[PDB]
């Protein structure tokens, strides 16, 4: 496994990744800017990835194409500034989330019948279930609410005050088989609704994500077995970041909190190893990848706008060779 | 609206893992070898290896294990695919039948997880009662092995240790345990587990984990009564069995790492090693008990993948870079001090790096030149399809009808007369050296169209006309004894032995032998049909008993015994056209018939020349004019040539008779000669022409090796000048320091770069380090003329051989870039510019540039170049240097680089395809569309000016369509992918051509050696073909029992969807080799209507493009 490109692709023909990888998501390159025609919360790509979605301070919801950069559409949604959103991989729903006006979420019919399917009063946030996007997790404080689609009705609350952390930012969760739940930092028996297990609080203000291989649990910095439940890994550069993996499972994206700082970085999602360190020398508000590895949204400001970049380009300044 | 066709032209040969063992029975000695898709089966003798069965898979072979159970009667076979297809096979044969029957089988995907980059990793324990598999990471598969599980159920259990370096199980363990390595931060470590199945868990390992030499990189599990494990790394060999530990660190290991390792003696007393730089060594472990360990050099072979030692000092050596290797080890040092001699040595074309297509023999039919094998068997490799023929008389004489040599002389044993027919007419020719001039001879007529001449026995010619048998004196040249049917009728048809005569009046067939001064009538009969054809050709010594004759009216080949004429046996043949050629032969003492049509089809059957028994009836076809078939002997072996607008050999290679073709355009007769002007050459005759020469080897593929004994990366030809142009890297030590004479070191004249642009790296002396050199090489003799070495540090990458704006030189251009192994990417590149004069090699022009010239071609009088993450142009100076003109700079690394006429095909390192323009008006690139999937490309062609291909390391090609007819600007600029279909090979290169002689053909090498063909098809062929194609996976059954729609299902890790766009040809192919009903029940009432002789029609025409 040499570490000069040239030589390790001699070898490919002959005869790893994570120095490619190394190579690839070290690298960002801005190149068009998203404003709005009368001078953002939330962003996210649609299901075939054609268009963005923005979320606005003032409850609105806009819509461009990534090819052209014009608004297609733009709705109202909500009354309270929008916070989070989520559409379903059929391209058929989508999920929102606003500060303070009831209903606090939302779930809605895509464009084709664009109309509001159900209602989410009490959850301040919300998202799918994982393998079949057929159920859907709300977060209300310390309790998590587990809802049918179709129905639009209540399945299950989770809640022990027992074994409560009382975290901040806490996210109820499913794993990618739909069967645990992670709320607080303690898992969750979807079938047989009791509690496995209550892991101890090193953080203020962070639940949790688990790992798509099903066999990890993400606290704050402390990679958890999901069977044997020992500290596994200590991964320090992750305190008080929010983890989004890549739609492959190879690379994490970590975005420092104090609602975001100047900068986010990569890892390498198999060793947890750090890739690098990007700043872009503004303030972060959210951000998201397409399923492509090609865009990557990032919403800041200045007046706040969404920037969009193009993965594994360099910067002018490391180009010019100063 | 793409349709596509992908047939394989020749099978892959490197050799990706091998096992021996008891598989066909409990006797007999088995060998097994697994190239990429195909697993060959041999059985071990004191000869060497004998091929039974050749079995072909849908996927390819990761895992390959052979055990017994307890109560089998014989080995089973275990194996596990790339796509996790398992399975167990068993051997059955009961008579000529060879089958390959499965027990079990069933996919163990786990639904959720990336695969371990390491790889996948199996092993079986002694006791029989599971399979482990590595297959993801922090997880460990089992396969429980109970005669109830013919489903092959698996369960995990979770592997704390993330990146696992090699598994065994151990020998003399209470309960299965395994011992392995994994690498922590702190180093890499050993550690024991137990398995248990009724727990589905592990308990704690019968001895404390240990830690090992960070390049540990092999665990050997030691049989008893020793036990324990070796662990073997860069630097030193342990032993490890609990309280036990021994450990020697040889300074011969530290040159070259350890990569392979075979069991010699069962009590695991005497094992075999092998390194990369091909050197092979013996462990040995004393008892007393295990004392010592101890290593002895044993000698060198190619470079090992596999080794399999067979029995009696016969080691089997499988290379994955080179030629596989059969090899003897005696225990006597020869005169060199080796203890090992080669006795054969298998051909790999793999890996192929790149390769280029030329017209070297006959221009108009191509060849390949390909870049083929690694660091010490790096070679050149010549590929010819078909056999051809080298002239050396050329003689206008058209029509003739009739070729027979003959020697005059009784004395002297070379033929020296070429008697040749013509329309009614006879004439003679005597070979005195060279010279060809016409002869008279006492006793011949030259006023009759002759049907047979030749020597007969005791001493006398016989000519054979359309009005008489003429029987001639051999020493004083005079007509001896003439025979006339009995009314004076006309002869029809002819055939004569050295001691038998046969012909024809009608139907009447008279027999006649040949005695001194005497032609001896037999027999006679009345036939109930006219004749057609006749044969007499002895099988055995000559005095043949039998006769064999095809007729008019009841159209059917008949064999009669002599003088009887008694039937024996007839085979009826369909069809209202009349045979027009029948022979008996022997190939590789098996007797066999044939038969050819007048349409140009030709039956073959087997012979019983005790019985006279035609069985298992064969049809082929060549061309469309009538067969004249005729026996010829080359390298004291026999053959057969067959004369048709198809001109085709016919031999036997492993007891199946094959077809090769002769790489000419149409020959109507032919006789074998051998005169002292023209010795074992063959004479040949079209309807202009008569011509003389000799012919190649009698192989359907010629391949011819070049051992270049360094590592070749690029090629292309220069037609201007007669030579190759050749890349290559020898590795040597820093003192740079070689480590064997290569073609670099042994060129006739030899240069270095005197260039000085590059006025802070430090070498550890001892480390590796590549050096390149640009090779020339002749066109005919293939030997090195010069070689140009380049800098220090510096790699050459690009090839191009062309002339560049109004230059009328023709040149060679290469692209390099400076390669320091502490940086990550390079920063500095050069592009320089050559010509070959007339013996010497002088540098033009050179082009300082930032990054490394990945990929550049000539584009229209300009050059089209790749730096690091840029596309560009530049022009040709009148002051002759290079000037650049346009940029482009939205991709990652541009790696590969193809152009049509003004259209720019671009592959990306992820994502796949860019298309680009020239416009002449700005002078600029416009980005006309890209693909936006995240494809790992690794080759790419040109197909058509609207669809693309490519082939990434996910073992998959893929088409991608421009819809030009645009309803809109953003759906304009999506290349949609509109084929998709899953190899199994890793592409380095797509070329332009074929290698038959007389739409649209592309080329392409892969790693395992394996070359195929993609030709495209149109909208009603591929909707026909692609029905057969269901309807033969419902009647051929494979093995494993895996369907050919999961395997060809286009797979990367992202996406999984099924095949469109192209069609297996080589299932399409496999047709023909399928039984008679079969096909009856493959054709049932399919429309698209044409059933079971049209379609025979159409693969027989598809099995002709390569």
């Not at chain 2, 727990?199 to 090992?212: A, S």
């Not at chain 2, 000419?664 to 050459?681: F, Q």
């Not at chain 2, 740079?736 to 590059?758: C, G, N």
Request: glycine residues 6%.
């Amino acid at each position: 496994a040499p570490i000069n490109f040239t030589s390790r692709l001699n070898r490919r023909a002959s005869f790893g990744g994570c120095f490619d990888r190394h190579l690839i998501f070290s690298r960002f390159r801005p190149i068009s800017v998203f404003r709005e025609a009368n001078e953002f919360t939330c962003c996210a790509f649609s299901a075939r990835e054609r268009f963005l979605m923005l979320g606005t301070c003032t409850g609105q919801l806009k819509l461009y194409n990534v090819f052209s950069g014009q608004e297609e559409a733009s709705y109202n949604c909500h009354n309270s500034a929008i916070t989070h959103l989520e559409p379903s991989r059929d391209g058929s729903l989508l999920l929102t989330s606003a500060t303070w006006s009831q209903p606090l979420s939302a779930l809605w019919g895509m464009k084709s019948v664009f109309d509001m399917k159900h209602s989410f009063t009490e959850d301040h946030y919300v998202e799918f279930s994982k393998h079949s996007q057929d159920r859907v997790i709300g977060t209300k404080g310390d309790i998590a609410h587990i809802y049918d689609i179709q129905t639009g009705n209540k399945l299950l609350t989770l809640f022990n005050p027992d074994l409560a952390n009382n975290y901040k930012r806490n996210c109820a969760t499913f794993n990618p088989t739909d069967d645990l739940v992670l709320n607080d930092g303690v898992l969750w028996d979807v079938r047989s609704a009791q509690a496995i297990h209550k892991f101890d609080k090193f953080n203020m203000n962070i639940s949790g994500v688990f790992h798509p291989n099903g066999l990890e649990v993400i606290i704050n910095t402390e990679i958890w077995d999901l069977r044997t439940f020992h500290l596994l890994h200590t991964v320090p550069a992750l305190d008080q970041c929010r983890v989004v993996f890549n739609h492959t499972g190879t690379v994490m994206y970590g975005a420092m909190l104090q609602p975001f700082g100047s900068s986010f970085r990569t890892f390498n999602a198999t060793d947890y190893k750090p890739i690098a360190t990007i700043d872009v020398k503004r303030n972060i508000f959210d951000l998201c990848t397409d399923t492509k590895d090609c865009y990557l949204a990032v919403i800041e400001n200045q007046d706040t706008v969404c920037r969009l970049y193009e993965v594994g380009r360099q910067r002018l300044a490391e180009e010019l060779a100063l | 609206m793409s349709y596509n066709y992908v047939v394989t032209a020749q099978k892959p040969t490197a050799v990706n893992g091998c096992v021996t063992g008891h598989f066909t029975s409990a006797e007999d000695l088995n060998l097994l070898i697994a190239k990429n898709t195909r697993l060959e089966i041999y059985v071990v003798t004191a000869e060497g290896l004998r091929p039974v069965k050749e079995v072909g898979m849908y996927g390819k072979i990761a895992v390959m294990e052979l055990f017994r159970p307890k109560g089998e009667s014989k080995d089973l076979l275990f194996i596990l695919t790339a796509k996790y297809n398992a399975c167990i096979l068993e051997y059955k044969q009961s008579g000529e039948s060879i089958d390959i029957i499965t027990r079990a089988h069933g996919n163990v995907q786990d639904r959720i997880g990336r695969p371990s980059e390491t790889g996948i990793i199996g092993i079986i324990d002694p006791e029989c009662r599971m399979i482990g598999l590595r297959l993801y990471d922090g997880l460990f598969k089992v396969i429980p092995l109970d005669r109830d599980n013919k489903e092959l159920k698996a369960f995990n259990i979770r592997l704390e240790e993330l990146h696992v370096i090699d598994v065994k199980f151990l020998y003399g363990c209470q309960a299965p345990t395994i011992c392995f390595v994994y690498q922590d931060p702190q180093g890499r470590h050993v550690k024991t587990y137990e398995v248990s199945l009724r727990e589905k868990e592990f308990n704690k390992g019968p001895w404390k984990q240990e830690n090992v030499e960070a390049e540990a990189s092999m665990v050997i599990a030691v049989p008893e009564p020793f036990g324990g494990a070796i662990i073997i790394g860069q630097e030193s060999i342990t032993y490890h069995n609990g309280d036990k530990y021994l450990a020697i660190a040889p300074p011969i290991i530290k040159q070259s790492t350890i990569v392979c390792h075979n069991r010699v003696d069962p009590n695991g007393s005497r094992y075999l090693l092998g390194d990369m730089e091909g050197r092979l060594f013996m462990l040995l472990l004393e008892k007393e008990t295990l004392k010592d360990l101890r290593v002895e050099l044993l000698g060198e072979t190619s470079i090992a993948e596999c080794l399999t030692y067979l029995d009696n000092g016969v080691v089997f050596v499988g290379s994955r870079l080179g030629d596989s290797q059969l090899v003897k080890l005696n225990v006597d040092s020869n005169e060199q001090g080796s203890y090992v001699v080669a006795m054969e040595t298998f051909t790999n074309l793999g890996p192929i790096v790149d390769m280029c297509v030329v017209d070297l023999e006959r221009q108009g039919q191509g060849q390949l030149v390909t870049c083929s094998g690694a660091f010490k068997e790096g070679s050149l490799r010549i590929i010819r399809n078909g056999i051809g023929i080298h002239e050396h008389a050329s003689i206008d004489l058209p029509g003739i009808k009739g070729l027979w040599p003959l020697r005059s002389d009784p004395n002297r044993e070379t033929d020296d007369t070429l008697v040749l027919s013509f329309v009614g007419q006879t004439r003679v020719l005597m070979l005195n050296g060279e010279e060809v001039e016409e002869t008279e001879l006492m006793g011949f007529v030259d006023d009759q169209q002759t049907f047979f001449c030749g020597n007969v026995a005791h001493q006398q010619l016989i000519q054979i006309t359309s009005a008489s048998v003429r029987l001639v004196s051999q020493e004083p040249k005079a007509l001896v004894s003439e025979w006339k049917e009995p009314q004076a009728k006309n002869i029809s048809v002819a055939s004569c032995n050295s001691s038998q005569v046969v012909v024809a009046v009608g139907r009447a067939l008279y027999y006649l032998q040949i005695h001194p001064q005497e032609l001896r009538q037999i027999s006679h009969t009345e036939m109930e049909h006219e004749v057609a054809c006749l044969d007499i050709t002895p099988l055995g010594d000559g005095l043949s008993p039998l006769c064999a004759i095809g007729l008019w009216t009841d159209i059917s080949a008949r064999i009669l015994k002599l003088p009887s004429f008694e039937l024996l046996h007839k085979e009826m043949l369909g069809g209202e056209i009349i045979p027009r050629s029948i022979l008996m032969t022997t190939f590789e003492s098996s007797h066999y018939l044939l038969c050819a049509l007048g349409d140009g089809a030709l039956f073959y059957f087997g012979l019983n020349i005790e019985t006279g028994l035609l069985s298992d009836r064969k049809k082929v076809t060549l061309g469309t004019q009538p067969t004249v078939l005729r026996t010829f002997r080359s390298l004291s072996t026999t053959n057969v040539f067959a004369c048709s607008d198809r001109p085709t050999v016919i031999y036997s290679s492993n007891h199946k008779l094959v077809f090769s073709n002769v790489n000419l355009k149409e020959v109507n007769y032919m006789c074998p000669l051998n005169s002292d002007g023209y010795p074992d050459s063959l004479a040949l005759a079209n309807n202009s022409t008569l011509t003389i020469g000799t012919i190649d080897e009698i192989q359907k593929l010629h391949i011819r090796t070049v051992p270049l004994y360094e590592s070749p990366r690029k090629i292309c030809y220069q037609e201007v000048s007669q030579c190759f142009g050749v890349l290559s890297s020898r590795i040597e030590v820093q003192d740079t320091t070689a480590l064997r004479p290569s073609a670099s070191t042994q060129a006739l004249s030899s240069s270095v770069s005197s260039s000085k642009l590059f006025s802070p790296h430090e070498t550890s002396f001892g480390e590796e380090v590549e050096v390149h050199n640009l090779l020339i090489i002749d066109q005919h003799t293939f030997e090195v003329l010069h070689a140009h070495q380049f800098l220090q540090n510096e790699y050459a990458l690009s090839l191009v051989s062309c002339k560049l704006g109004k230059d009328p030189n023709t040149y060679f251009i290469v692209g390099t870039a400076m390669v320091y192994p502490e940086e990550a990417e390079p920063k500095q590149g050069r592009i320089v510019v050559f010509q070959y004069s007339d013996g010497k090699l002088q540098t033009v022009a050179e082009k300082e540039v930032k990054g490394a010239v990945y990929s550049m071609v000539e584009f229209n009088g300009k050059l089209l170049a790749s730096i690091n993450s840029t596309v560009r142009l530049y022009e040709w100076t009148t002051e002759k240097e290079l000037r650049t003109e346009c940029n482009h700079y939205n991709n990652i690394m541009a790696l590969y680089l193809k152009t049509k006429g003004d259209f720019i095909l671009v592959g990306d390192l992820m994502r796949s395809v860019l298309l680009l323009a020239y416009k002449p008006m700005e002078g600029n690139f416009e980005e006309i569309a890209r693909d936006f999937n995240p494809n790992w490309m690794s080759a790419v062609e040109i197909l058509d000016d609207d669809n693309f291909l490519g082939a990434e390391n996910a073992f998959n090609l893929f088409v991608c369509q421009k819809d030009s007819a645009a309803t809109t600007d953003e759906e304009r600029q999506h290349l949609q992918e509109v084929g998709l279909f899953h190899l199994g090979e890793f592409v380095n290169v797509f070329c332009h051509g074929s290698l038959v002689m007389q739409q649209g053909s592309v080329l392409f090498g892969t790693v395992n050696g394996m070359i195929g063909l993609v030709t495209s098809l149109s909208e009603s062929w591929y909707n026909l073909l692609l029905d057969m194609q269901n309807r033969l996976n419902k009647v051929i059954k494979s093995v494993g029992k895996i369907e050919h729609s999961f395997w060809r299902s286009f797979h990367t890790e992202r996406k999984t969807e099924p095949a469109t766009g192209f069609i297996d040809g080589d299932l399409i192919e496999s047709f023909l080799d399928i039984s008679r009903p079969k096909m009856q029940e493959v054709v049932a009432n399919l429309q698209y209507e044409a059933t079971a002789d049209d379609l025979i029609k159409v693969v027989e025409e598809l099995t002709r493009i390569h």
